[PDB]
Amino acid sequence: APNVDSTVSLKGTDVFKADSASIAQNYTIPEWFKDAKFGIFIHWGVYSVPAYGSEWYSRWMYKEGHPINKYHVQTYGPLTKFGYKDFIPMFKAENFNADEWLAVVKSSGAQYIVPVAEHHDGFAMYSSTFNKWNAVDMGPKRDIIGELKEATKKAGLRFGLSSHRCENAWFYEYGMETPSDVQDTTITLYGERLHEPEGQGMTPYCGKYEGSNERSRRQFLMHTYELIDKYQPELIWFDWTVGKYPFQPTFYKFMAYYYNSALDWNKEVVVNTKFGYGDNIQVFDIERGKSDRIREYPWQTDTSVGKKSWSYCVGEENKSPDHIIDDFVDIVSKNGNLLLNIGPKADGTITDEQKNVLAEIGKWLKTNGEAIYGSRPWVIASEGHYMTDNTKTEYTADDIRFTTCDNNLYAVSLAWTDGSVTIKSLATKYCRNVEIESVEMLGSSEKIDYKMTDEGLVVNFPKNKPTEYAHVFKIKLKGVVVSKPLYDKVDNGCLITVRVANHNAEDANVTLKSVVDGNEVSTQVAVKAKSEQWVKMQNKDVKSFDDMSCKFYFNDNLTYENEF
Ligand SMILES: [K+]
């Protein structure tokens, strides 16, 4: 018997209390998530029935004049005869098969699966007790989440799920401003019918509208406790409004109960949020942005295989496997995981086109997975590379992404060349006693011709492509390598961030020197054998960040200077 008035687990474990300091004291992001790299998101629900391509159909159909409202009144009927609830009898899922879904997910090389347990629209995809608008009692008349959990265990993968229910508090607000079934306030599917919280984007401020109330906060705990107690997910992903200030005390109660319960399961778990919580007590799920930097904290990022939509819509144009694999490699090199979405038809079938994209990804990982699974960032993630034209810029073989695992260096070219590439990150100035022991291309039987030069490691491509899309050189080397330095302003000075890899079998002592506007900062760092570390330095008394002179030395070699 679970109790939303207590964060203590069913077995009596109370290590975690519902506050940030408690969580940070006892929780650590698990190694399985960092090792896994790749999961599949599955946006499937009542919104798949109209097949419009939008999980926000339920919101906009009640906005008089909106394209979706106009579509819905013509296609299905007036909002008073045909509300969102009235799609539910059509959501029969006659061809849903949990084992077939998992066979697709497994075929992709993905290591965890994230079905939607409940979106903003109020319909539980699982066996809910308090929410009578659920898939066991209605629609498919089966426990979709339960069947996926059992299928995932037999498939040998890890089971996660997502909750978007927090937004149900306000999602249907427009139904109260035009004649509609939402105005029957006894229909609990349509939530609290509040105004959407204010705030531009990923911000905890909510303005005049909290976006939740006492009852929806209570139902959120009943909802998450249900999922925790019935399905023991290893990962729970949340949509953005759980970080609004009025919701945070409630969210911390859930986190404490989840992390306490996980201790009893002897399983380490992950929470994803988009903002509001520290990067050490959960795993940020964020857009990639334009930065080429490795992130210090593990993170996740999501994209759909569909170019137009996440949930199914007719006339979907799917992305190419080349597109997804190149982005996947970029993400993994910068310490991220990819959560890739597919959108099955309302009847439960994953489209042939989306099956084919996942299978091609899995074929690529069959040959190249050594560079991906269990890897960590190297010292630097990449090299290579408003226009008012179509510039048709694409990746070439000079666009390289790096990972490391078991002291091996993997250099992934994001396109083919019949010639050679030069790994510029291994140029003389970045290196101390680097000696290349061997170079191979993953999946190729051809001996790779390479030459270490002062400009970097020249690698000649073999004559036969082992796979399409991206091409992995596995490099065994000894020596110490340092990254290009990164600069950030921090009041009257600048922070300097550098990563150092010691590929030697012996510990190495390494001197880094930053000279900014004459001010010299040195650090002596002991880097253990076959290990990497971040190194942070700060120069003081920098009058202008945009105008400073910068010189950076690695064991008395000039590695960087901004003379331009
Ligand atoms: K490519």
Distance 324 CA to ligand 1 centre (A): 9
Distance of alpha carbon 121 from alpha carbon 68, whole angstroms: 15
Distance 436 CA to ligand 1 centre (A): 26
When computed from its CA atoms, the radius of gyration of the chain, rounded to whole angstroms, is: 26
CATH number at residue 228: 3.20.20.80
The first and second tokens of residue 289, run together, are 């942005």
Sign of CA dihedral 252, 258, 263, 268: negative
Beta strands 38-42; 112-118: pairing state: parallel
Compute the residue count for the chain.
Answer: 564
Ion ligand 1 — residues with CB under 5 Å? 322, 326, 414-415, 469
- Determine contact, residues 500/525, Cβ cutoff 8 Å: yes
Distance 414 CA to ligand 1 centre (A): 4
Distance 225 CA to ligand 1 centre (A): 43
Ligand-binding annotation for 507, yes or no, is: no
Distance of alpha carbon 267 from alpha carbon 160, whole angstroms: 13
The first and second tokens of residue 4, run together, are 């939303």
Q: Which run of H or of E encompasses 403?
A: strand 400-405
Distance 469 CA to ligand 1 centre (A): 4
Q: Please give the single-letter amino acid code of residue 356.
A: N
Distance 326 CA to ligand 1 centre (A): 5
- Determine contact, residues 9/310, Cβ cutoff 8 Å: no
Distance of alpha carbon 66 from alpha carbon 81, whole angstroms: 18
Distance 228 CA to ligand 1 centre (A): 40
Look-up of token digits 């926000």: 56
Distance of alpha carbon 150 from alpha carbon 146, whole angstroms: 6
Count CA atoms closer than 13 A to 4's CA, side-chain side.
17
Distance 325 CA to ligand 1 centre (A): 7
Distance 323 CA to ligand 1 centre (A): 7
- Determine contact, residues 24/252, Cβ cutoff 8 Å: no
* Alpha helix ranges (H) inside 156-247: 214-231
Three-class DSSP category at 468: coil
Q: Which domain holds residue 206?
A: 20-371
Distance of alpha carbon 33 from alpha carbon 39, whole angstroms: 10
Sign of CA dihedral 51, 56, 62, 63: negative
Three-class DSSP category at 266: coil
**CA angle, 280 as apex, 275 and 285 as ends, to 5°?**
35
Sign of CA dihedral 151, 155, 159, 162: negative
Ligand-binding annotation for 19, yes or no, is: no
Ligand-binding annotation for 263, yes or no, is: no
Q: How many CB atoms lie within 10 A of CB 198?
A: 14
Count CA atoms closer than 13 A to 377's CA, side-chain side.
27
Distance of alpha carbon 532 from alpha carbon 402, whole angstroms: 14
Going across the sheet that includes 557-561, the strands are: 519-527, 508-516, 550-554, 557-561
Distance of alpha carbon 170 from alpha carbon 548, whole angstroms: 50
Backbone dihedral region for residue 167 (phi beyond 0: left; psi -120 to 50: alpha; all else: beta): alpha
Distance 503 CA to ligand 1 centre (A): 28
Distance of alpha carbon 241 from alpha carbon 337, whole angstroms: 22
Please choose, from the candidates 420, 320, 336, the residue with its C-alpha nearest in 3D space to the C-alpha of residue 377. 336
Q: Please give the single-letter amino acid code of residue 114.
A: V
Please choose, from the candidates 258, 32, 34, 285, the residue with its C-alpha nearest in 3D space to the C-alpha of residue 157. 32
Distance of alpha carbon 480 from alpha carbon 66, whole angstroms: 60
Distance 321 CA to ligand 1 centre (A): 9
Structure resolution, Å: 2.0
Q: Please give the single-letter amino acid code of residue 541.
A: D
Beta strands 493-502; 508-516: pairing state: unpaired
End-to-end, the C-alpha distance of the chain in Å comes to 67
Ligand-binding annotation for 414, yes or no, is: yes
**CA angle, 13 as apex, 7 and 16 as ends, to 5°?**
55
The first and second tokens of residue 65, run together, are 């004049």
The first and second tokens of residue 210, run together, are 């909290």
Distance 331 CA to ligand 1 centre (A): 14
Backbone dihedral region for residue 311 (phi beyond 0: left; psi -120 to 50: alpha; all else: beta): beta
Sign of CA dihedral 485, 486, 490, 492: positive
Distance 310 CA to ligand 1 centre (A): 23
Q: Please give the single-letter amino acid code of residue 216.
A: S
